[PDB]
């Protein structure tokens, strides 16, 4: 059964290597979440540092692709960094060739097209990662676009990725049924981060310290990650309400 080793069709019209690349996504056992505010887009991810000897500042699955675009990865770090370096290069080249900053959705498409090539061409394996791109686009506003090993991509009102993704997804679905709107109706990004953390706590059913989370925030003209103390300040605000 060599149709399960390389990316060719099986008798039932399936690509098993692509499906097994999807299972590699959850190898890290980390759950991510992304939501949109009025002026911003917030992405949060669990941070697990098991070994005491590790330098916790270097353990990260959130990447700054360009000034405006941020990317969180669900999957093994080597493939994550492979995708990050390529995305960074693609975003830089776009700006040079076309004279403006690469949009979040266009980069998502480009990385998705690259992922598609690995599903069709035999010598290249798929990357075992799901890439979630976030920005505040100058035309489309707050944006969340997500890519997978199949080469699929789509925009999102909000999203979640990981082992307990479905619990987080339904938690967010139920909120948008109630609010009757496509986003978090909130002025400051600080409270949008507080929303993101709160609803992750409810869905996963775990509490978080400052070192258990990792936060990325996209505003107009910059994307930035939060430090441990920035998250701690945010956790204190939730606790006092």
């Amino acid at each position: 059964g060599y149709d399960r080793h390389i990316t060719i069709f099986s008798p039932e019209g399936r690509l098993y290597q692509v499906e097994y690349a999807f299972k590699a996504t959850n190898q890290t056992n980390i759950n991510s979440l992304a939501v949109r505010g009025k002026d911003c887009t917030v992405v949060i991810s669990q941070k697990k540092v098991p070994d005491k000897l590790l330098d916790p500042t270097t353990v990260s699955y959130i990447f700054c692709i360009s000034r405006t675009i941020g990317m969180v990865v669900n999957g093994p770090i080597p493939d994550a960094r492979n995708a990050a370096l390529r995305a960074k290069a693609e975003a830089a080249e776009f700006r040079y060739k076309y004279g403006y900053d690469m949009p979040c959705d266009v980069l998502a498409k480009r990385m998705a097209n690259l992922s598609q090539i690995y599903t069709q061409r035999a010598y290249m394996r798929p990357l075992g990662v799901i890439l979630t791109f976030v920005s505040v686009d100058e035309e489309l506003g707050p944006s969340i676009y997500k890519t997978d090993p199949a080469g699929y991509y789509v925009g999102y009102k909000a999203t979640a990725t990981g082992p307990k993704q479905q619990e987080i997804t339904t938690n967010l679905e139920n909120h948008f049924k109630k609010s009757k709107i496509d986003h978090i109706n909130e002025e400051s990004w600080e409270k949008v981060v507080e929303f993101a953390i709160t609803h992750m706590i409810d869905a996963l059913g775990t509490e978080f310290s400052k070192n258990d989370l990792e936060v990325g925030v996209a505003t107009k003209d910059k994307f930035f990650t939060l430090s441990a103390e920035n998250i701690e300040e945010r956790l204190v605000a939730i606790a006092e309400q």
Partner: peptide, 11 residues
Amino acid sequence: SSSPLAMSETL
């Protein structure tokens, strides 16, 4: 639609 959170207009 893959998910109801997904914006089907973008696809």
